[PDB]
Amino acid sequence: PNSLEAQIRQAMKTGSTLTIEFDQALNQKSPGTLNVFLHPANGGVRIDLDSGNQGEPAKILWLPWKQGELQTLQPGSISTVDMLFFTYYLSGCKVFAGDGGPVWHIDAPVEANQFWRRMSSDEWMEDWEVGTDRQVAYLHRAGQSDSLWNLSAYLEGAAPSTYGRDNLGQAVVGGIVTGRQQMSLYQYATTSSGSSAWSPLTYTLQQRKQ
Ligand SMILES: [Br-]
C-alpha cells in the first residue's frame, strides 16, 4: 500500500471507509501545524505522538477539542497543497468552517447564541458584513436540542450538515489543503451501526442576517 498519509487522502477523495483513531494527548497541542505519527489500525489509521509501532511521521493541520469551549484554526496556518487537516472527534460537538476563513470546533453543550457571540469577535467574522455572503460548512449532530446548534437567527442559506441520529453518534472531520488559506473538507460518522465512508463536507452559501 502507500504511505498512511496517502491512504487517508485517497480514502477521503474516493469516498471509501477508513477510520481515524486519535490519541487524546493530541488535545494538549495547540491549533495549527503539528508533527504527528500515523500507524496502521484495524479498519483505518491511528494518529498519535508515538514514534514507534511502525509509525510514519506526518505534518498536519490540527484543531483540538476543549471541554466547554471553542477552539479555532486560523487560515494563516494553511499553505501546503495536499497537507491533511484533522480535528478531534465530534462528540455532539459542532464544526463551523468559513471557506478561506477559520475552522471552529465547538463543544456539545455550548449554546448556539453563545458560540456565535464568541466566533463573531474573529477578524474574518468582523469582515463579514450583514447582507453579504460567505461559503460556510457547518456540521451538528442530528436530534440535538436546537439551542445547541441553530444559527437561523444569524445566517440564511442551506441547512447545516448533520451526523448521527436521535442525538446519538460521533463524527470525524478532516480536510485536504488545496492552496493558500484553502481547504476541501471531508467527514464520516460512527454510530451503533458502524462507521460510514468518507464524504465531502460542503461549504454552502450563507448570507449574514445580523
Ligand atoms: Br448533546
From TrEMBL:
This is Uncharacterized protein. The modification Cysteine sulfenic acid (-SOH) is found at C93. InterPro entries: BPSL1549. GO terms for biological process: symbiont-mediated suppression of host translation initiation. Pfam families: BLF1. It comes from Burkholderia pseudomallei (strain K96243).
